[PDB]
Amino acid sequence: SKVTTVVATPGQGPDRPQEVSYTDTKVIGNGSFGVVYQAKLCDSGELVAIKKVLQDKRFKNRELQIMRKLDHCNIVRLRYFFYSSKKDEVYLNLVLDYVPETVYRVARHYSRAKQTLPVIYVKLYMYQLFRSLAYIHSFGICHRDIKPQNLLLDPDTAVLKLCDFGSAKQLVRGEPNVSYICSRYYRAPELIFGATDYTSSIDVWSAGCVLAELLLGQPIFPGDSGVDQLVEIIKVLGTPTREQIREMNPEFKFPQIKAHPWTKVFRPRTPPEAIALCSRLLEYTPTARLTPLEACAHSFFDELRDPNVKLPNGRDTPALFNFTTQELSSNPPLATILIPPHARI
Amino acid sequence: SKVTTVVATPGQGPDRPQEVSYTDTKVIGNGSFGVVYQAKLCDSGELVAIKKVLQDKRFKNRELQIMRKLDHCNIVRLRYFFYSSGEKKDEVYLNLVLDYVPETVYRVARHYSRAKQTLPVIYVKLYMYQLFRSLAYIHSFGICHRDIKPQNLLLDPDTAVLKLCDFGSAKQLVRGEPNVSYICSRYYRAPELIFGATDYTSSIDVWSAGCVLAELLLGQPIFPGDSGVDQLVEIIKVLGTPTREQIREMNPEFKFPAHPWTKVFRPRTPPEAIALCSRLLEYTPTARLTPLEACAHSFFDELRDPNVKLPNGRDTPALFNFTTQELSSNPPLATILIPPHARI
Ligand SMILES: COc1ccc(CNC(=O)Nc2ncc([N+](=O)[O-])s2)cc1
Numbered sequence: 267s268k269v270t271t272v273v274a275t276p277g278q279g280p281d282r283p284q285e286v287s288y289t290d291t292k293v294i295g296n297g298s299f300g301v302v303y304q305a306k307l308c309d310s311g312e313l314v315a316i317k318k319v320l321q322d323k324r325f326k327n328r329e330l331q332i333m334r335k336l337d338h339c340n341i342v343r344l345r346y347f348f349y350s351s352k353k354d355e356v357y358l359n360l361v362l363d364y365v366p367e368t369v370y371r372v373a374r375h376y377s378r379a380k381q382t383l384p385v386i387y388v389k390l391y392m393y394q395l396f397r398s399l400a401y402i403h404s405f406g407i408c409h410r411d412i413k414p415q416n417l418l419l420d421p422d423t424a425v426l427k428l429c430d431f432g433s434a435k436q437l438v439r440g441e442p443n444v445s446y447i448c449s450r451y452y453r454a455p456e457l458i459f460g461a462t463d464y465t466s467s468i469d470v471w472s473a474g475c476v477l478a479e480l481l482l483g484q485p486i487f488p489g490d491s492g493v494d495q496l497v498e499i500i501k502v503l504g505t506p507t508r509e510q511i512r513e514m515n516p517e518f519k520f521p522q523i524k525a526h527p528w529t530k531v532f533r534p535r536t537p538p539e540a541i542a543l544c545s546r547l548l549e550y551t552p553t554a555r556l557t558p559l560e561a562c563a564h565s566f567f568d569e570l571r572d573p574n575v576k577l578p579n580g581r582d583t584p585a586l587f588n589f590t591t592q593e594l595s596s597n598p599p600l601a602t603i604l605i606p607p608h609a610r611i
Numbered sequence: 612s613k614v615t616t617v618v619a620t621p622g623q624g625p626d627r628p629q630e631v632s633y634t635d636t637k638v639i640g641n642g643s644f645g646v647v648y649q650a651k652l653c654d655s656g657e658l659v660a661i662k663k664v665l666q667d668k669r670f671k672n673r674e675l676q677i678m679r680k681l682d683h684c685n686i687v688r689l690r691y692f693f694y695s696s697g698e699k700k701d702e703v704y705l706n707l708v709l710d711y712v713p714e715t716v717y718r719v720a721r722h723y724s725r726a727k728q729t730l731p732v733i734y735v736k737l738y739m740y741q742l743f744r745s746l747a748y749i750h751s752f753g754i755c756h757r758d759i760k761p762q763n764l765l766l767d768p769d770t771a772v773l774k775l776c777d778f779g780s781a782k783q784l785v786r787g788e789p790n791v792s793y794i795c796s797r798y799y800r801a802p803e804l805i806f807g808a809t810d811y812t813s814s815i816d817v818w819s820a821g822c823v824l825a826e827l828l829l830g831q832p833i834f835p836g837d838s839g840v841d842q843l844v845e846i847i848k849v850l851g852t853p854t855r856e857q858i859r860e861m862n863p864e865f866k867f868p869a870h871p872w873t874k875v876f877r878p879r880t881p882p883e884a885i886a887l888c889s890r891l892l893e894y895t896p897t898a899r900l901t902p903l904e905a906c907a908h909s910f911f912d913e914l915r916d917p918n919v920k921l922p923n924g925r926d927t928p929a930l931f932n933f934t935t936q937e938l939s940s941n942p943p944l945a946t947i948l949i950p951p952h953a954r955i
């Protein structure tokens with residue numbers, strides 16, 4: 267069909283634009299900040315995603331600037347970017363790697379089939395999500411919108427890639443940040459309470475909500491309003507001590523409810539390690555939550571470090587131990603756990 | 612079948628306990644706060660709703676205290692209230708016996724939406740008008756509902772009567788006193804709440820009502836979004852970017868990267884309906900119409916017509932028996948609100 271040719275700038279390396287042609291354009295999803303398309307590169311035949319957002323000439327696009335700096339196996343790669351044109355309006359086009367599925371779509375499949383995602387996949391997906399967070403957090407960048415829809419999945423290789431950096435921002439201690447980011451169901455308590463001094467740990471809470479959801483087969487803290495969502499949290503974590511509330515946001519009345527034993531939250535067959543990890547991610551006190559790197563090192567992921575592990579389709583697991591110094595910067599000693607004896611010999 | 616008899620306190624008037632018996636109990640809908648049941652009064656066979664919530668031993672229920680003060684045709688009435696148990700040896704439960712209403716705007720609107728149809732404008736007028744009366748009334752006492760949404764608007768299919776319910780988030784707003792900004796359900800939250808304001812006023816209810824009006828006219832929520840950011844984008848598309856001063860009026864803070872109003876609704880949408888929406892959904896809280904002013908809007912002129920009738924041929928509900936209390940915010944408006952024929 268129609269062949270579109272543009273002069274695009276490579277995502278990484280020096281700003282040296284090159285002519286790029288693509289075709290077979292289709293809509294993948296319509297988001298508030300723009301539309302995402304699927305296209306095929308005439309050159310290689312590779313499929314790519316093109317995120318198109320309205321861009322005003324007076325100020326640089328933050329998502330673009332953040333993506334040009336990222337380079338990690340568990341984060342969607344920015345291949346190129348370019349501008350296009352009703353008319354007086356200019357659009358920034360982000361050419362990203364295209365990934366077939368999302369955790370949202372896959373989980374929905376199981377949910378509908380009255381089944382739950384096999385735990386091996388929960389381990390694979392969550393471990394990789396934590397690696398992506400360890401990486402961006404090492405640069406002080408907080409995603410701020412971790413949710414199933416932003417977790418891309420390749421069904422064949424079991425590779426997970428974090429996407430949509432439209433809400434991402436470098437968090438600088440002392441500088442206020444809007445509390446209205448992050449999607450409902452996945453918002454950390456401090457955000458619901460209106461904190462503007464939150465840290466990257468809000469990504470860890472969101473991650474914990476995703477893990478819980480994959481184990482449960484449905485969101486763990488649903489609610490149409492903040493109040494409702496907080497009630498669901500309280501029912502599991504128990505009523506927050508005024509100390510913990512202080513930890514979240516430096517004035518409401520909540521029902522005094524005693525913590526619900528995490529073991530009774532999930533079905534009987536739920537692995538003990540999964541429940542334990544959840545409880546260490548979903549904590550009221552932000553600073554008490556595990557860091558992404560610490561989560562990766564958790565016992566729940568031990569099976570991934572077993573030399574004989576294989577994917578259900580018979581293929582070998584994706585790369586899981588190619589850690590860089592940057593990625594391990596928050597706690598280098600964890601390398602002795604994260605990189606097993608058999609890895610990268 | 613099973614008959615339950617309890618001794619309850621009247622919702623209003625002297626505290627003369629009354630023996631109440633009901634049967635055929637069934638869940639109407641659960642909810643973070645408390646479960647709501649449907650039950651039938653033994654003698655009269657009349658149906659009622661029973662809202663059961665855990666009784667907090669330290670303080671008295673705020674919903675109860677507020678409900679005991681209300682008496683209005685467009686607000687569900689608290690007939691009685693009593694205590695008991697229901698789940699586990701200790702915890703006490705507060706039971707609010709309320710008037711039962713057949714439908715909700717949520718349920719009715721969904722039926723039309725599924726059939727790709729929209730509620731006839733005459734009903735939109737009647738429902739929204741009664742909603743605004745209920746707000747004028749509670750606001751006259753300084754009480755803000757804080758959770759106006761289709762699910763909390765009860766409807767009687769036959770009489771076209773609308774009643775506001777669920778005062779679980781309602782609160783007396785006092786100038787100078789902070790209030791949590793995490794109340795109100797997604798889609799219906801005023802911009803100032805999204806921005807985290809804690810000094811908001813009863814006008815957040817007007818914004819929510821505006822969202823319901825727009826939704827009934829459109830066939831779907833007007834400002835959808837899974838995050839506050841997304842919601843703000845939808846709002847910006849319609850209202851345009853907020854001036855830095857408008858931002859100041861909303862929340863005494865970052866950035867944002869095109870639908871007028873006459874391009875939002877279907878072709879034959881009444882002009883007055885669009886005008887009303889634009890005056891309810893304003894960034895500057897103080898710029899929004901008050902509930903009483905909304906009732907007086909031209910969109911509701913047809914309701915003041917002497918010959919107006921419901922589609923089923925019945926007369927409309929009583930729409931002009933305003934009390935001094937209801938008009939207190941602006942007595943002079945009664946010259947518009949009360950039609951000539953109503954003064955005969
Ligand atoms: C039928 O259209 C589709 C096709 C694929 C999907 C799920 N697959 C995807 O969303 N893949 C994506 N890759 C990269 C993205 N990005 O924005 O950076 S989105 C959903 C709908």
Ligand SMILES: COc1ccc(CNC(=O)Nc2ncc([N+](=O)[O-])s2)cc1
Nearest residue numbers: 639647660687709710711712713714776
């Ligand atoms: C099938 O059970 C039902 C029956 C009716 C409905 C809709 N009708 C209602 O909810 N009516 C209500 N009346 C009073 C209420 N209150 O809380 O004060 S809720 C929903 C479910």
